[PDB]
Each structure stands twice: as C-alpha cells, then as structure tokens.
C-alpha cells in the first residue's frame, strides 16, 4: 500500500536559492553527509527518470543506495526522488518517495514541505522504526543543501 506523512519546516534561505541547491545535490552531499562518498548517474541527464547509485559507509562498510528523479517543478519550487534500491528498503518495502516542496515564508526564509511516501508490499504497514529512519534521512539531506547555502552564501 502507499501510506504518506507530511511535515512543515521553516529555513532562513530563500526558496530560490534553496531550490537551485536541491537540484545540486549530486554534488553538495557528499560534501557535507560523511557517510556519503560519492553520487553517479546511471542513466539519465539528472531530469526526471534519472537513476543514481550513491555510494554510502556504513561503520567502515562500503554500500550502495539506488535513486530515481521523480520530478522538478520550478513552479512550485518542487524537487521529487525515491529511494529505489539499498539498505532502506527491506522485503515489504518496495519504494520510499521524498518529495520537498518550497514557499516564501516571512522575514525572508522559506516554508518547506516534507513529503514521505512509505510503498509497502501489498498489505503490510511501515514499521515504525523504519519509519523514523526514512523521515530523519529526508530531514537531514535538506539540511544538508541548506548547511551548505548558510557556509557558502557567495554561490547562490
């Protein structure tokens, strides 16, 4: 089944430039995430349908995550991605969707939209835990961009 969660976040940078930053992300995380070493494009021209392997360490063990572009929408300051092979998905899970999605927010800042898509295998539910994980690691990518802008305001 598909079961959604939605959360509201708050940034000081502005949605341009956190925008431009997202589309970025190839090389801005594993700049700033230390577990992540490297992002390579498997197919794809970095639009929607695009496929990366991101290359991970995980307590000094090398692993691969496997993503697919889902969609950009300028017009929504919008930038989708699932996590489509790896460590997070385990057998009733078969897809998680981050999408992130951005407004003007006052005093300068911007609103940010969280969106976790959890795809289960037919009727089972996301654990609970796992569940956690996948909004953490949502979380902590767009800090990520956003920790970046903040240390180099020059670039956006």
Same mark, same amino acid.
């Given at each position: 089944?598909?079961?959604?969660?939605?959360?509201?976040?708050?940034?000081?940078?502005?949605?341009?430039?956190?925008?431009?930053?997202?589309?970025?992300?190839?090389?801005?995380?594993? #700049? $700033?995430?230390?577990?992540? =070493?490297? +992002? !390579?494009?498997?197919? &794809?021209?970095?639009?929607?349908?695009?496929?990366? @392997?991101?290359?991970?360490?995980?307590?000094?063990?090398?692993?691969?995550?496997?993503?697919?572009?889902?969609?950009?929408?300028?017009?929504?300051?919008?930038?989708?991605?699932?996590?489509?092979?790896?460590?997070?998905?385990?057998?009733?899970?078969? #897809? $998680?969707?981050?999408?992130? =999605?951005? +407004? !003007?927010?006052?005093? &300068?800042?911007?609103?940010?939209?969280?969106?976790? @898509?959890?795809?289960?295998?037919?009727?089972?539910?996301?654990?609970?835990?796992?569940?956690?994980?996948?909004?953490?690691?949502?979380?902590?990518?767009?800090?990520?961009?956003?920790?970046?802008?903040?240390?180099?305001?020059?670039?956006?």
């Amino acid at each position: 089944g598909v079961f959604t969660f939605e959360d509201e976040i708050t940034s000081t940078v502005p949605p341009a430039k956190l925008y431009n930053a997202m589309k970025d992300a190839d090389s801005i995380t594993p #700049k $700033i995430i230390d577990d992540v =070493k490297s +992002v !390579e494009i498997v197919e &794809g021209n970095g639009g929607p349908g695009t496929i990366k @392997k991101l290359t991970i360490v995980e307590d000094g063990e090398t692993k691969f995550i496997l993503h697919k572009v889902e969609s950009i929408d300028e017009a929504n300051y919008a930038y989708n991605y699932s996590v489509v092979g790896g460590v997070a998905l385990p057998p009733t899970a078969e #897809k $998680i969707t981050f999408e992130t =999605k951005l +407004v !003007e927010g006052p005093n &300068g800042g911007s609103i940010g939209k969280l969106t976790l @898509k959890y795809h289960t295998k037919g009727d089972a539910k996301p654990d609970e835990e796992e569940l956690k994980k996948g909004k953490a690691k949502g979380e902590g990518l767009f800090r990520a961009i956003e920790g970046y802008v903040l240390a180099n305001p020059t670039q956006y």
